[PDB]
A paper describes a structure:
The particles harbour 10-separate genome segments and comprise two principle protein layers, the innermost composed of 120 copies of protein λ1 clamped together by 150 copies of σ2 (viral polymerases, λ3, are attached inside adjacent to the icosahedral fivefold axes). The outer layer consists of 600 copies each of μ1 and σ3. The array of μ1 and σ3 is interrupted at the fivefold axes by pentameric λ2 turrets which enzymatically cap the mRNA transcripts produced by the polymerase on egress from the particle. Here we demonstrate that vitrification of infected cells followed by cryo-focussed ion beam (cryo-FIB) milling and cryo-electron tomography (cryo-ET) allows high resolution reconstruction of assembly intermediates of a mammalian reovirus, allowing atomic models to be constructed which throw light on some of these fundamental questions.
In addition virion-like particles of two types, ‘empty’ and ‘full’, were observed. The two virion-like particles are extremely similar, with the exception that the density level is much higher in the interior of the full particles. For stars, analysis focused on the fivefold regions using emClarity16 yielded a reconstruction at 6.6 Å. For the empty virion-like particles, reconstructions focused on the fivefold regions and pseudo sixfold regions yielded reconstructions at 6.5 and 5.6 Å respectively. We believe that cryo-ET of suitably prepared infected cells will be a general vehicle for understanding virus replication-cycles in atomic and molecular detail, with our study already providing a reconstruction at 5.6 Å resolution from only 65 icosahedral particles. If there is indeed some similarity in the assembly process, with collapsed particles being transformed into an expanded state by the recruitment of the RNA genome then the empty virion-like particles we observe would be dead-end products that have failed to package the genome. Indeed the proportion of empty virion-like particles observed is consistent with the known ~50% failure rate in packaging observed in strains which do not organize their virus factories in association with cellular microtubules.
Residue numbers in the entry: 1 to 365
The structure:
Amino acid sequence: MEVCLPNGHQIVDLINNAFEGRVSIYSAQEGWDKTISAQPDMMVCGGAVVCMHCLGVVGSLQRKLKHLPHHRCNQQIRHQDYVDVQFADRVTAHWKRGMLSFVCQMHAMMNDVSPEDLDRVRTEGGSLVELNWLQVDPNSMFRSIHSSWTDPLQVVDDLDTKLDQYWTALNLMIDSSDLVPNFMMRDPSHAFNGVRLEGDARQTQFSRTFDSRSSLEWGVMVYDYSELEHDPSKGRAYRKELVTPARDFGHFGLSHYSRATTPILGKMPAVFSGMLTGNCKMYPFIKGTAKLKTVRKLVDSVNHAWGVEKIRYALGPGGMTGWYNRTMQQAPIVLTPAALTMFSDTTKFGDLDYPVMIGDPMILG
């Protein structure tokens, strides 16, 4: 056996899928499965098949593998060296299911509207549908304390498909109706920095990162649209005229800005792409530079494990360190789903007029 070490691009690729929850991993206990936890042995990286315990190039795409033959290994790789990545993706699975079930609940509630009250609100405004956040999946690590990352996951299929269906249907029903909920955002940059806080919101802090060093179990933070409904000088007419995100995005069938909500799960506000690209997609804002910070200990370890020739020949000039820094330059763009630039920049009802606090979810006009 003559194992080798891969190249930068595929590493970035693996980094991305880590925040994409789409990596194919093998584990004889689970084989392909990842619903439950167990140590890994081989993983894919930008199209390559790698050992997880000598981290050598053991294959690629055009040929699948089924089991590990006796190969030339080093067995110097530890769990904490990589626990971070499957850690983050287990987080991904959690949070994706959470936002998913959220959407399911929301469209289900929407799936109950009758025309009479409908027209009454259209003529009047006010609340239409309200939801209790306490009853929203306590089992989630965003909602339970005895739970953990390692907890085996829940099985669903074509989550993307159903997601898009329901985001589509729901926001279209709103579009026809032109309502305004207190849990949506036009510039989520404000969320972790750029918002006004009030009430127990004075007590929330920010890590901006996947970190077991922060509790993500938490309530859900929304606007204060109560007085908004109360405001007669900005009444039903005005309410339609300025606050409807058609002002901020136009038709939901005219998607050219990305659509974000408040920090729903674990203080995380996610955004939606535009279907006029073919389809819409949810994404939690994650800084690529953080993902860079992850690989640092690995740089060290490999410095310690392997020779200068290989790194000049595997991660090239400046070694993987020069790779680190040049990629560190490249980051703000090479790490960018397009929605990361689909932002809106004019709110026509103001936002620092309304604080954010943990209350019961709802949509009003």
